[PDB]
């Protein structure tokens, strides 16, 4: 379940960090990358608590 | 590969109206239209938008917001044979000015008198076409000029024509940013034993 | 005014041969270089054959290749030509005209000027099928 | 509206020199490009040279590097083409054309002139 | 265009899709995994209409064939059992007369041709001559299907896929499966060709169709029909007066719908077997557990909600009507230069 | 007193990027810099973080983490002349994009094609700068625009 | 990528009325701001009016109050300026611009249109 | 539009939000050649505001 | 600027047939709506029929269902209203009028015609 959740968008336009990165300007990609970061931190924290 | 066009110095005119000429290999489009014909040198000005004239009004018109290129060069070598290359024609009189990108191939007799001649040729009843008298001794203002117009259109359909793309490699034990046909990433590239199916 | 009446058209079997003529009036035969054309129904006018004013070049078009005999008679001021080994592609309307007068337009000058003299145009059909 | 008038043609022995000038009249300036072309009987035009007013985007055909030298006189609205060491090949019928080479869009030779002739021969024209 | 002589109509049939119609949903390599994919698939154990092209009969009723026009919906699954290669291609479009646009696919005998134009398709298209004493036996008369070919947007040519047939005997020898899908402008055709040994139905088994082409057309496509090569009977030894004849052949049409499947990627990049996550409760168990074997137990697979039958609304008694009668039913009105004005507020108009 | 400027309606653009304009009066800044230049209206878009174009790439670039205010107003009444004000220039070709707040006043000839052209002579070799044709008859989209950042 | 289309101008006697329409095409919107600016020959641009996509903290210059009214139609992606009581100085070149007016940040006038002219005169244009 | 009634009897703003409803009253009014109870302004010093 | 011209009125026996034509002139059209009304002596106006140019928003009164049929010819900018089986009730003055029926907007009747008479009687008009 932890390895999966790297394929989840969490609301961004893509789960591939580079695709977001190489397909938008910095100020617009920052929000998407922050959304991915928040989702992945939440997943890792859930794993650690369990 | 527009390169072979825009750096030749063999063209008497290479003018683009919505895209930089030297920057054509990067911008890309959904459809391209290569229109082609032959005119006289003094007449080339009229293959451009806005202006008025015989071709501008009766043979071939460009919209005021044209997004393509015009490429014209002499062909006195090819067309004017010895005593006349009357192969080419043009419209002299027409009832109304052509709309942009409209082709009229009719041979209706133009009427300027008070009575429809209806198949009779005479005063104020003229054949709609006149032929170019290309001879190699004429002045370049009258000599043949091959003209090609490259119009570019960006429809919603999947873009099809795009310019060439460069390429480089650095394979083993190097941390590299890499772009394989749109698959972008960062990492070290190593030879593999995997067996991907052909597609 | 100058006139060029065309005649000699008709539906002919493929592989045969026919002939057609252009009677020109209003100008001297030697003044203008004369010739014919061909109009495919869905394509623009094309040049097939032409006779020099004196008869020097009498050049032709390689589209019809060697299947030509053009001949202009000065007494009647009339032009003739014939087709051999007829094929369907030859099906078209053939016109008659005389050159010599071409518009002279100076840089940003006047486009209005003298023009050549055209004819009437006669249709020729080539097909292997018969007619009612 | 606009007229181009040439001058300076003639004949000269091989290895000589000549000077072809021409004046424009009727062009509102901005980005004038005036360019000299040659016509070799039995061939199309070949770029001889060209120059923009004060833009100095000069062109010289590859084979003629050094033989030609282009110059302007904006006050007189004239363009000059000095030639030195005329080889026999240089014989041709010369013209100058006026247009506009906007850097962002491209060049168009809108208008052409009457012309002069250059004869490289051992016995003149 | 030729309107054929006398077709003998028979009621349509049905079959059982079995575990057929699974294709590689993407061009990605995965090794020794189970992958859950939501995509347009052919539901397992479905009807799939069954059409014939068998002219031969017992002299009671001959001339049996089937080229109806069939809607496209979200996708199509075509399958062919034919030791004749009489099926040559298809047409797709919205209004297949001349108006919007149309896509033709036809396999010549050595090079398949795809074109996108505003055709003028015949009411009953076919591929012209397919018998001897003429342009060989087979001949693909592109003008017998259409009469107009104006304003073409796309043309393409590639190596054939019909002619994989091996041997001409024994009922049918090669089942040929195609899947047609028009998504975001791209027209995707997947195909696979597999030997067969039985008749009247698809073969039990699992065959993963691979992608043949992803053509960038952009047309809509809402209907289609099959292009069938037909012997022309005006010279044949058998019943040769004016009409046409055919051999023995049959095809299968099914409609894809959006389903979630579980696919098994081998140690190679090969799909081996798949599970339909909506076929039956056991399949949902398998999909929720992401495995093909389920141990003894009780598993919570899904949820159940009694959906609402209808919708109701109730506002109050609607009584405080505005006094429009005093303004539209007044005995005398005011002068236009001195118009009367009445304020309306706190009432239902 | 930035409020006087904000509440004037004499500016076509007044856009701050890390501070709301209404608050500027209440803050104290360490170093404050004013960058002045003329562009055309269709180009005033590009003076903003993350944009792309001729100005944003070859002439004037703002950092992605910019903190400040862009002000722009039409100057057709002081920068365009009947005969044409050709005294304002912009960079049109350059080998690479500028770094943020990096000035370039070079005038070396830019080789646009594949013709090595060291010197004034050469083909498809352009003078890197280009002059705005600010005719007063131009559409507002092509008129001059004074910008202070 | 975008276009603004202006129409509805002309000439009218003092004290008349008009209505100028500007159509927008090519914005993802979110925070559209469509405004009209006035160009008096021999001067620069001046604010006339502005409106958001439903925001409606409209603007009107000091000397322009009352006479002018601003309206919008998101379905057609159009904005209109009703003109009333045309006092002579209102003879000028009206242009519609589009951008974004953010509460927190400010405004930018990203794009401008073709424009149209208005003539407050006793004898028309 | 402009007119005597519009400019001197009843004028609506060009951004009007309401409705106009008109119906022939020949049955109500116009009984005989003796019913002239309605008036309209023909001259004024200035046009009416909305 | 406009002028509506009627024709075709008269008298007919009960159960007969008639046809009334109306010609419009002076309309930019776009959304023309033509309506026929009838006035029996001693009351207001009653709808007889109404149509829009090519929109076919045709209207028929409850009583005239079947009795009245109507058609239009845009090229001749004319509208014909035929009637069959004329009952004595329909004796009245018929008028043709024009306006704009914008579906999203409502209906208006800008102008009215000159009018004619239709008399259903045993001894004519």
UniProtKB/Swiss-Prot annotation, chain B:
Question: What segment(s) does the record annotate as region Disordered?
Answer: 92-127, 156-178
Where is the segment annotated Receptor-binding domain (RBD)?
Answer: 1-178
Q: Which superkingdom is the protein from? A: Viruses
Instruction: Name the reported effect of residue 114 to N.
Output: In strain: 20A.EU2, Iota/B.1.526, Omicron/BA.1, Omicron/BA.2, Omicron/BA.2.12.1, Omicron/BA.2.75, Omicron/BA.4, Omicron/BA.5, Omicron/BQ.1.1, Omicron/XBB.1.5, Omicron/EG.5.1
For the region Receptor-binding motif, give the residue spans: 74-145
Domain BetaCoV S1-CTD: where?
Answer: 1-164
Please tell me, according to the UniProt entry, what happens when changing residue 82 to P. Answer: In strain: Omicron/XBB.1.5, Omicron/EG.5.1
Task: Tell me what happens on changing residue 127 to L.
Answer: Increased resistance to neutralizing antibodies and human covalescent sera neutralization
Per the UniProt entry, the effect of residue 8 to L is: In strain: Omicron/BA.1
Please give the positions of the paired cysteines in each disulfide bond: 16-69, 28-162, 117-125
- Specify the effect of residue 123 to V: In strain: Omicron/BA.4, Omicron/BA.5, Omicron/BQ.1.1
Tell me what the record says results from residue 90 to F.
Decreased HLA binding to NF9 epitope. Increased binding affinity to human ACE2
Annotated region Immunodominant HLA epitope recognized by the CD8+: where?
85-93
Region Integrin-binding motif: list its residue ranges. 40-42
**Complex formation:** Binds to host ACE2. RBD also interacts with the N-linked glycan on 'Asn-90' of ACE2. Cleavage of S generates a polybasic C-terminal sequence on S1 that binds to host Neuropilin-1 (NRP1) and Neuropilin-2 (NRP2) receptors. Interacts with host integrin alpha-5/beta-1 (ITGA5:ITGB1) and with ACE2 in complex with integrin alpha-5/beta-1 (ITGA5:ITGB1). May interact via cytoplasmic c-terminus with M protein. May interact (via N-terminus) with host bilirubin and biliverdin, thereby preventing antibody binding to the SARS-CoV-2 spike NTD via an allosteric mechanism.
Q: What is this protein called?
A: Spike protein S1
Q: Which residues of the full protein are shown?
A: 364 to 562 of 1273
